[PDB]
């Protein structure tokens, strides 16, 4: 199938530039403009520009021309974009995007994975793990919610995996909020009493932004 | 530059029910006989997808539940029926002049039967106790709708602040949400009291669901 598979994200002090990709597979890259959009946590949808890859031209958006530079690499049928002068109000999720349909006003028929953004100056920090189990002496009832709290890290994401994805369907993921300029979510999953204990139950934690993994065990206290 | 303001920004529809989503440009978006005004479906977490172009085309693999409609300046998407994995935001954009413009999305929500939460509270672990650090945390889970008051009490008198809130987006299989509601106190804080609730105030009950525990044991 046509795939755009953008770059990971990106922490990037104020002032300084980022630059991004854009990968097109499942047609001729030549064959396509290339638009970028911008979407800023987690609402509002804005176009960037347009590249002609094979040719080209490109063209910006007027409120986007200090700011946004775009690229091709025909070669390797990768998209560019770059972004100067970084503020907090480029923190924000870059998609790129397909062209479709015969002509210049063509809609966006594919979009790429997009790439985060965070324009801060807080340093890259790995989370403090900690487990969530009954409890004091006792469970209560007939299901029982267990959980990792994930803490003070910087940036955003984690992925928090339990009994490296065994559990799945009962799991929920808390989005992350800012406390002290460092992160906090949590995640919980939901198993029967009758299998716990006796029945361990793991989460992973990763921050790739650290390279750190973390396992911890539901003991019981 | 061409506005479209998008109506609702948020709307409650029920499974088998019709969702109507509106979209009004400050320019006529027509030319060529054509109107250039495409729909996107973005589940969060997710890319945009596209579901209409000029108005009214279903793209492939988008099924026949989605449809567009208007000319000019007016156009409507319907969703019928609705199903609980609709769940979205859906945005209108116009591209018949540069730059291309959005509309500031429409939040769909899946309307459906009050559900209490299943709460669930969880003192400082060891572990984060031996950093100096103590939060206390209580899980809130699958309940409906997503309004509800969670309370912290610490031997009684209630405390704000160091209360982080936070939900998930509605399930897309069970319409429900969870919420988890952190307490942060130092260890010091922490070690001087001795009962914690976490009580949740929702809309199935006049009456609060608590949650407790006592340090001491
Ligand atoms: C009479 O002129 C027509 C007619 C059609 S039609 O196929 O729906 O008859 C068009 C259908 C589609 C058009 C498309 S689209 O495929 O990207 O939606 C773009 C343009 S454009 O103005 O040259 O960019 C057009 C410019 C003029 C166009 C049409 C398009
Ligand atoms: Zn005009
Ligand atoms: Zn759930």
Same mark, same amino acid.
């Not at chain 1, 994200?9 to 403009?33: I, Q, R, W």
């Not at chain 1, 808390?174 to 009758?194: E, K, N, R």
């Not at chain 2, 495409?38 to 589940?43: A, I, L, P, R, V």
């Not at chain 2, 969870?178 to 009962?195: F, G, I, P, Q, V």
């Given at each position: ?11 990037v ?6 630059? %991004?990709?854009?990968?097109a597979? =499942? ?6 403009y %290339?638009?970028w ?17 094979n ?9 986007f021309k200090?700011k ?12 560019? %974009?770059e ?5 907090? !109000?480029?923190?924000?999720v870059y ?7 015969? =002509? ?9 994975? =997009? ?5 801060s100056s807080?340093?890259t ?9 009954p =409890?004091?002496g006792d469970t ?8 990792? &709290?994930?803490?003070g ?13 065994? &559990? ?8 992350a ?7 906090? %979510? ?13 029945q361990?139950?793991?989460?992973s ?9 973390? !396992? ?6 | ?11 409650? #529809? ?16 027509? @030319? ?17 997808k ?7 085309n279903?793209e ?13 300046t ?7 029926? #609705?199903?609980?994995d609709?769940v ?7 591209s ?22 299943? #709460? ?10 031996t ?5 206390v ?8 709708p ?16 160091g209360?982080?809130?936070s ?8 319409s429900?949400? @969870? ?8 260890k010091?804080?922490?070690?001087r009291?001795? @009962? ?13 669901? #608590? ?7």
């Amino acid at each position: 199938e046509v795939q755009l598979q953008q770059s990971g994200p990106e922490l990037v002090k104020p002032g300084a530039s980022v630059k %991004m990709s854009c990968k097109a597979s =499942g047609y001729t890259f030549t064959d396509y403009y %290339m638009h970028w959009v911008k979407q800023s946590h987690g609402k509002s949808l804005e176009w960037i520009g347009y590249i002609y890859p094979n040719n080209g031209g490109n063209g910006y958006n007027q409120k986007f021309k200090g700011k946004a530079t775009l690229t091709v690499d025909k070669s390797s049928s990768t998209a560019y %974009m770059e972004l100067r002068s970084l503020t907090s !109000d480029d923190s924000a999720v870059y998609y790129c995007a397909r062209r479709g349909g015969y =002509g210049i006003r063509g809609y966006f028929d594919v979009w790429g994975t =997009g790439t985060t953004v965070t324009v801060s100056s807080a340093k890259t920090t790995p989370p403090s793990v900690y487990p969530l189990a009954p =409890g004091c002496g006792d469970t209560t009832g007939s299901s029982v919610t267990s959980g990792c &709290l994930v803490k003070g890290y910087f940036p955003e994401p984690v992925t928090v995996t339990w009994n490296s994805g065994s &559990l799945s369907s009962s799991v929920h993921t808390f989005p992350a909020l800012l406390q002290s300029g460092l992160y906090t %979510m949590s995640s919980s999953v939901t198993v029967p009493s009758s299998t716990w204990p006796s029945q361990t139950v793991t989460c992973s934690v990763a921050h790739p932004a650290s390279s750190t993994t973390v !396992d911890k065990k539901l003991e019981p206290s | 530059d061409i506005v479209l303001t998008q109506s609702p920004a948020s709307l409650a #529809v029920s499974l088998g029910q019709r969702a109507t989503i509106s979209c009004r440009a400050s320019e006529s978006v027509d @030319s060529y006989g054509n109107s250039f005004m495409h729909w996107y479906q973005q589940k969060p977490g997710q890319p945009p997808k596209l579901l209409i172009y000029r108005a009214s085309n279903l793209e492939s693999g988008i099924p026949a539940r989605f449809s567009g409609s208007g000319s000019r300046t007016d156009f409507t998407l319907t969703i019928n029926p #609705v199903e609980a994995d609709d769940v979205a935001t859906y945005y209108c954009q116009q591209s018949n002049e540069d730059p291309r413009t959005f509309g500031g999305g429409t939040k769909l929500e899946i309307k459906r039967a009050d559900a209490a939460p299943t #709460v669930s509270i969880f003192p400082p672990s060891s572990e984060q106790l031996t950093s100096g650090g103590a939060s206390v945390v209580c899980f809130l889970n699958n309940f409906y709708p997503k309004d509800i008051n969670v309370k912290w009490k610490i031997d009684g008198s209630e405390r704000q602040n160091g209360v982080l809130n936070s939900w998930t987006d509605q399930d897309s299989k069970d319409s429900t949400y @969870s919420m988890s509601s952190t307490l942060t106190l130092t260890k010091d804080e922490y070690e001087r009291h001795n @009962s914690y609730t976490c009580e949740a105030t929702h809309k199935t009950s006049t009456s609060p669901i #608590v949650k407790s525990f006592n340090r001491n044991e």
